[PDB]
Design a protein around this ligand. Sequence first.
Ligand SMILES: C[C@H](CCC(=O)O)[C@H]1CC[C@H]2[C@@H]3[C@H](O)C[C@@H]4C[C@H](O)CC[C@]4(C)[C@H]3C[C@H](O)[C@]12C
Ligand SMILES: [Zn+2]
Lengths: 128, 459, 99, 174, 171, 32, 55, 88, 63, 56, 55
Amino acid sequence: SFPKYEASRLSSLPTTLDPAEYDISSETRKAQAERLAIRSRLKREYQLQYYDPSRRGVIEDPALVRWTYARSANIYPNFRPNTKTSLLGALFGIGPLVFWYYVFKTDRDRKEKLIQEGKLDRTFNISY
Amino acid sequence: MLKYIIPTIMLMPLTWLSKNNMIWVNSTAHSLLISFTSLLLMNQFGDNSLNFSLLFFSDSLSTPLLILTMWLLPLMLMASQHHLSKENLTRKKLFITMLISLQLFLIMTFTAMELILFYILFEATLVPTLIIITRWGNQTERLNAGLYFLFYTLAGSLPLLVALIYIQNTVGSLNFLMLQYWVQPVHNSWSNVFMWLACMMAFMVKMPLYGLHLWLPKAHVEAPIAGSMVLAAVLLKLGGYGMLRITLILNPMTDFMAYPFIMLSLWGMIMTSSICLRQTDLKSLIAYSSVSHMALVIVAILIQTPWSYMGATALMIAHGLTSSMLFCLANSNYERIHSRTMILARGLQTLLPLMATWWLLASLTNLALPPTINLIGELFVVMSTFSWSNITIILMGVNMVITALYSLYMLIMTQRGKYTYHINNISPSFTRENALMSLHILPLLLLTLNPKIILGPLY
Amino acid sequence: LRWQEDPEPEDENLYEKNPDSHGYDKDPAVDIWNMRVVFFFGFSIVLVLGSTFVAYLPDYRMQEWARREAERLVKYREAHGLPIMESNCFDPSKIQLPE
Amino acid sequence: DSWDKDVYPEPPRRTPAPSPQTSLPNPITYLTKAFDLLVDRPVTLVREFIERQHAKNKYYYYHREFRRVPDITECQEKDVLCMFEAEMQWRRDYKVDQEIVNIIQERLKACQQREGESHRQNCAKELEQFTQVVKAYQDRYHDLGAHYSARKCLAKQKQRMLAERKAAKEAAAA
Amino acid sequence: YLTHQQKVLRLYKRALRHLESWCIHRDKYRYFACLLRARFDEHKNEKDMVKATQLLREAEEEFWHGQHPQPYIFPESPGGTSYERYECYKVPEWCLDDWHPSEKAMYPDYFAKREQWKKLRRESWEREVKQLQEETPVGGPRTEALPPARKQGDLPPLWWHIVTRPRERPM
Amino acid sequence: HITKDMLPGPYPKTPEERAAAAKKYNMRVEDY
Amino acid sequence: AALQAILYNRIGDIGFILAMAWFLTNLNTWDLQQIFMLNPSDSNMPLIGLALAAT
Amino acid sequence: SDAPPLTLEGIKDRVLYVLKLYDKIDPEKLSVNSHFMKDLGLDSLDQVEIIMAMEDEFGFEIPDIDAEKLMCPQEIVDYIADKKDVYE
Amino acid sequence: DKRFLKLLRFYILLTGIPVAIGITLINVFIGEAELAEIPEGYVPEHWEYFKHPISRWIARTFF
Amino acid sequence: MNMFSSLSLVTLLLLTMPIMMMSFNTYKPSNYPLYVKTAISYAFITSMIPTMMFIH
Amino acid sequence: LLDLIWLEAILPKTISLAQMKASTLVTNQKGLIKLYFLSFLITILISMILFNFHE
Ligand SMILES: C[C@H](CCC(=O)O)[C@H]1CC[C@H]2[C@@H]3[C@H](O)C[C@@H]4C[C@H](O)CC[C@]4(C)[C@H]3C[C@H](O)[C@]12C
Ligand SMILES: [Zn+2]
């Protein structure tokens, strides 16, 4: 009796239970060899100028430039006003504003009427 | 007000006629003397403002802003000494000339008694501001930032010019002393709904208001050190200051025309504050923080109550001495590693022990830690808005929680943690950098002893 | 190449040529004096004398005067058995209401 | 010599006499003597030295008194030289009336502490005065907004008077 | 990757530490320590790929269902209480170039020998660069392992950041 | 120094663009 | 852990700001001496604010 | 931290001590360069338990990637000396 | 970092000590003023409505 | 009351003395831990006199 | 979405885009004397007929 472990985006599937990690062929093994190839090709480019004694500065990291350039300055050029963007924009953008306008219009109007009729307790309210 | 205009002009003859290795020493010395003499404007009385002549007056709203404006010119000269070391002598002189011109227009903007003179000088602080950003920036995006900055302001200022001229013809004058005793209620009609927007829109783009705020993340990020400090300390308060004066001739229509603007600001705080948590650029994070704090200022002015106007002044002065410090602290890192990304240079509390203390004080003030003047300003606004509507506590409270997350998060990411291994040029902090932060934080804490001098005219 | 452009100049560490540098200028004679004016006028003249000047300002916005004034009125008001504070700011004998 | 006793009332003191009933010593009595000898006595000597210095050079600061002037109700419309006189005076009354309320709030707050657990009953006189001056203040200096002016205050009074004199007709004409 | 031979060993070591948590006591723990070892010996000799993998794959399912929710973690291991407790004192060695002469004259011997190490590093650099170029394949390194020095007068390539690392207890 | 070609950009459509992008980000055409 | 404590304390401080606002508006004071003397009868809101802060 | 400083001599004595108490290794034919596979006849499972015994002796884990690569008491002594920074 | 603090302390106290010394001497030997009723037919100068000697100096010399 | 007031305030100020001395560098290093501990002790005794006057 | 896309989409980007399009229509002329003067005729006929500028 070993109930299945059901994962989610907040509970990753353990590497020791993933089926793909127990069925291994030559073609699958080849990929791991080349993933480690790039993983080792970049290491030396870093370690050739990391260990240099005639260096006083920062090591430019293109992997970081691409990450931050994509996060800020490459969103609009890749935006199509489709239906997903349109509906979400209206719901997220203008949706909250409409909600709060009527929540405060109703309250103030209700609070206005009570003071008009003089049935609101304001005995000691002299700071506003 | 001629005792502060002529000396500020005389800096330019001093700057150009000085020796070639004393332009920074002379300019910094006599700017501080002008700042020292600025204290004479605290002669305010409880009933009548101080009226020097037909052109200039200084009540309690402008005295805190004049002193802050004149106290930054000495600091912006210190901050610019480094990245202008490898610069031609003549261009360095022109750079100082632009800074002195900006101070001259600002000291006159906050003192002008006529609203037309206010508009001319309120608009004249765009030429020197635009030239500093575009000429002496660093990124290619600086040119596109100057365009957004110029046209956002002018797209709203031109309608204002048509309202002030109209008001003079239909009232008789724009002198602010007269308008107190000659103002008449604004009848509710479609014609006046557009007079109201004309008078207010020109000042809600410089605050800035949420929605009309895309020029701030570009101007305050691509601008040099001197431009950013003045931009987020002295040029955002022009809109807030202008509204405090222009809403004198907009009652009772201000009661029902402020709903679309309060809601934008109340929900603009949460939105912009949330955007801080997920920023990769350290300068940008400090740029969005300004929008969040100024949204309290806009709501404070609209609700038109004594407790909002008092806190509104405090939030403007306190924010100026906090944002300016944060930019200077963020720039100290940028003058060593040469990359604005926040996650690149981590663990700096093990290499720069004293500089990790200024971050803390600046960060502590940003999150409104009592009893600093940031808290007094924010507390008062949170009291006035509660009377306006009880439910406002839900929105105002959420901002305080989020504001603590991104202020301390910035502290943790850059300072705490494990230092970067391949960053091997983190030189010890200079005296110049340390003196720059001290002049930001020491004034910001002494005011807590005597806060009455930053609470505006209602006090 | 696409043009004859100078190579990016390496950063200069100001602590090398002048280990006692204050960070202001590359000329040791200039650097010391720049620090002195920043420290002297900035701190001694503005943040010490300035703090004293603000502390000892004459009564600011006559806040104190209103205190003595009120004490006089409260004494007078209670001595003669009048209300401490009226509910009308302007005497309702100089007002002519509509109709 | 000190603050006027009429503005800030203080009930008469009632100090119980000591009633020891044990042979053990009283640490408070001894510590009081030590305090009066190693602390209180030196302080008095220095103050008397400082007090005598002020006697050599004595001078006065006077209380500013404002001659009263016509109020806004006596000012023609758009006559700034008269509205200015009436508005500035009205403001000095706004500042003073605030202090009048503050002095009452000290009295109320003082009584509660002095009365200890019996504050509900023995401070009713102070509380009643507070409920009055607050009502008066709220009538003449409330809901005027941030741009308060004599004109708006007069408008509020002329509005309340209309309701007061209007509502009376229906009630009084029974 | 992890060969099937390596997987069991990791599953054995990790199956003992967790089993140690439940038992706590030495007497009880040793009793079931032997029993666990037997279950690995009763099938170790089999050399069938399908049967071998299935048992290992099936054993992990049992392991997951029985893992202690709060396994013992060493004080300075990943996730432990003292992990990284002393990262705030490991100052990089290059910080000593920025010292003032006043605070270098207090340690004349250490800064005299440091020059010896500094002089050595400059002399041994060009040799290390050359050594890697020839032995590096045409494409590039295909594994993460440096070659040792291959003659007198040389130091192993890329040695400065493995030799001069901060001590585990700087202060 | 980062050149234009070594930055993110528009969504690829053709397999050569996918293969070219996988080299830009230092990955493999099978994982990118 | 350090940031977590700030986050939870700040959430509670919403109740603390709520109570100050209510006392100032409905009693015109922050001192405890005056709050006790005026002894509000409708006090579900200010006291729930303190209860939130206490949590 | 107010604890005795490990020494190259001290570590070597304790590595051999644990092995000499293991009831699968003849004490007399155990030396400082005794391979556990050939020179002593122990499979890979036994080497896993030997590592666990050593770390319990010193109270600091050795990773799996490195643990399998130690098959000699000298290697154990050197590895511990490298983690604790022993130079004498 | 230490050198910066020494300069800040030195200059804060460069004028701090005389100001602390000067303020004390004024209070001990010149003291405050006393409140008096305005004599009949007398118009006090505008710097004769404040208490502290230092404040009356600001009123007379600057404001 | 004369003594009750003075001894209640001196408890608070005494605790701020170590901070003030350390700020302007008016202390001796290597002894601060024993300095701050001693200040608490004398602050504990000074707090008792107000307490005893309350009990009585 | 609400800061880098839509608030950019509505006011700044679309207003600028319209100006670029209009500038093309006004400046995409062919430099013909024949085509310019033929338009002057249309303006006068429009003025006299549609708007009555002749009166
Ligand atoms: C009294 C206390 C411990 C005495 C003891 O346990 O033997 C000692 C330890 C270090 C001392 C302090 C340091 O010597 C630094 C200061 C030097 C002077 O004694 C004045 C106070 C001063 C701050 C001292 C007060 C006190 O005497 C201290 C605090
Ligand atoms: Zn640099």
